[model samples]
Target chain A: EARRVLVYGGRGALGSRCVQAFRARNWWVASVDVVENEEASASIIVKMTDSFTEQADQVTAEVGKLLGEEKVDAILCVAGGWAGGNAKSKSLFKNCDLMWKQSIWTSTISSHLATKHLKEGGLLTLAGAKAALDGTPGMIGYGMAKGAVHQLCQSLAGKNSGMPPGAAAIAVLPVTLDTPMNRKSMPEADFSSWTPLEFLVETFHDWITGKNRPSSGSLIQVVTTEGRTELTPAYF
Target chain B: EARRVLVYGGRGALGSRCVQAFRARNWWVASVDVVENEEASASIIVKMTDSFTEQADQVTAEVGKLLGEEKVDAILCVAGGWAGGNAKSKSLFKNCDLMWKQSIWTSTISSHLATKHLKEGGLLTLAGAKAALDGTPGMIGYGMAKGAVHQLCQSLAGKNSGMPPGAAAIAVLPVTLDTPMNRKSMPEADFSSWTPLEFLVETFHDWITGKNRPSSGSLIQVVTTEGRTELTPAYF
Candidate 1:
């Protein structure tokens, strides 16, 4: 039941790694990112929209190219930047509350587009950082936004939008990963504990287009490789 | 560590039966409810505060009287009405979303105020209808409000302000019973699946103030004597 897949922000470090993982699985990949990572087998390279207002125009142009030969079966969004610490830092806004647009913007565009075109038995998935599990002081906005993404996924699941039958919306919530950026940031910390990009992508695969019957409106926590937590699988 | 335990709504059909069950185990009872049967030992007749603002006032005064002679170990809430119907039926706009407020106000006031005065390890458990589980048609407001109660319990767990140290909050989400109301409504449906009042109240005893760890935000489904489908745990 799986063939085509799309990766938004497919050129970013995490996004590109996920794309490679999918490609290795022999999936027909559709890639979209602002910067051109020529190393990527980008079926299409698209710029981020100006804002929510210009979404219609951008969606039309890019989707037109991406949907040429293959149908979009699944969408994986890792299209967010590190913005919370910057927003609240003294250098940015001396006193204003922090603004985290990572999850907000990610959900806004990804959910909007996926709901519009996802095929039956198709999966629409997004990303939420582990900040959602344990709150972070400097990255409150980031955490809030990611947490909202989980909520967004739940709301979507609860909705009976006239999507084709057997469709699902799921998000993977992961902690700081064992990626290059994380290694550089927490160099002294145990790198072994960090979840490698490979495992994170596999989680996406497990949720959607996998053997598992995914849960609706539930938060599935993807633990780090070193410290694992087990949760009872619930079906409603 | 079982001591004198006070139960609000102790004279309701299930409550009175539970009082007998507890007394059977030799646990002392201090109780309150609108009407009482011969089963209650120290049942007090006190009117509940009609508004959220007055709930704390009423609860503190009553708890003061109940706990004066001997420190009360727990206060379990079994007081509530079928505030309304499923989430789909009670649309928010109809009552300015007051259905949500009305259903929640009773448990909220009681639970919050009880926490203010309840002794350590003194459990504060409330009851929820099993109907709150899946989205139903008629009692949306009640479902929503009960949902809020579940949320409140989850929020209060592990906090020191309300009850004594290690206090717990549990909810009884029971299925419809073979009560008078149910018989009048569904004359033909098979009633075997319904849960009995005695069974529900007993389950409440084990869940609320029992030795088992409290399930703050979680809910359990209760059935009736004939086992007909009935209440949803959450209010709209």
Candidate 2:
């Protein structure tokens, strides 16, 4: 009796909030994650495989099975992870592999799902980080993954990008998100400067409701200061 | 009597020219590639494996065996491939995987090599594409690969990014190269508008010799409008 949406990272804190919000709004919701989200109307567990093509094929196939002859109103890719390492870090190779799989591969798979299941003029969001706009000496792999995500977002915004007409492919670049994990890691940090999860849930909801959604190809910076958040659009 | 250098993709046409130039100059050169580059003073065959960590480990181990008590003056990473597909392309995931393995992984490995094997005040060059500066809907995987490479160069320039003091990380963003492959693909295109391989060889040699190398983190665009080519520095 309402709209439909899909959450690509329904396991994360921010992602779980999104799932709860969509359900509260009476929207049919789907979750894709390593583990099942009981709250989601549908769940697609990510398969563990060595080959990129094999894993991608499994997700695409499963996504196809769940939404036959139907289209989702929006596809939200909140799937992400973090690692800190300089180029000389002992774990540089390992971290790069892990971060890329968690970030870039997920975005790639989500894009395909949007292409196949998202309705015309629907919304497709990719996760990004404001830190990726500049040098991240402390986290080379994380920066590279986010930077590539930004590029993919821009590509999807261009003409003939394969998205349904009028569909927007936007990347949300958040600064410091207020998550329980973040608070636990940096107990003494200023909490006011951290973006609250509710802000994101509202912002994403507004965009889906066509609240002056940014043009395709824009990267929105989500910054919080003194318990307030702002959205600034940029391309580069 | 001569400086040392490592060419990551020493088997390709552009890379082979670089090898020839380095040899002609009597520099002690090493190549890391799938097949042996007989012209190089040493060659490290890239290992075939399922895990990125495994493959990276093999290359790093062999590099360690080759240069235990030495460092390189310059490390040139020219490994790359081009694949065209929009977000909706059927081969999107497969091509993205292939292009990423060829481009980003090689760049990551090159950065590590520089960290471990390059001398202070040495040089490291990454392959980039001018098209990556903006949206590339027609060739998404290629653009994302190079975009990540661009971000990596910027990261390496940041403080404590792992390169030794005085070392420079620069990315060469080329519009098109006048390779036989290019001629075969675009036979009707004007030849003068293509970058000559000799020009790159000469430019690379000049940088290796301390010629006005652009500062670290610069993306140098190689553009050939008519019969002449130019190098433009940009960041964004």
lDDT for each candidate structure: 0.55, 0.91
| Per-candidate alpha-carbon RMSD to the true structure | 12.3, 1.3
Please give the distance, in angstroms, between residue B113's alpha carbon in candidate 2 and its true position after superposition. Answer: 1.0
Where model 1 places Cα greater than 4 Å from the true spot, the runs are A39-50, A68-70, A83-101, A133-137, A225-236, B1-236
DockQ of each: 0.02, 0.86
Candidate with maximal lDDT: 2
lDDT of 2 by residue, A56-100 (tens): 999899989888889999999999979899999999998999889
lDDT per residue as tens, model 1, A26-58 = 877767666665544554545344233344346
TM-score of 1: 0.47
Q: Which candidate is the best by TM-score?
A: 2
TM-score of chain B of 2: 0.97
How big is the positional error of residue A76 in model 1, measured in Å on the Cα after superposition? 0.8
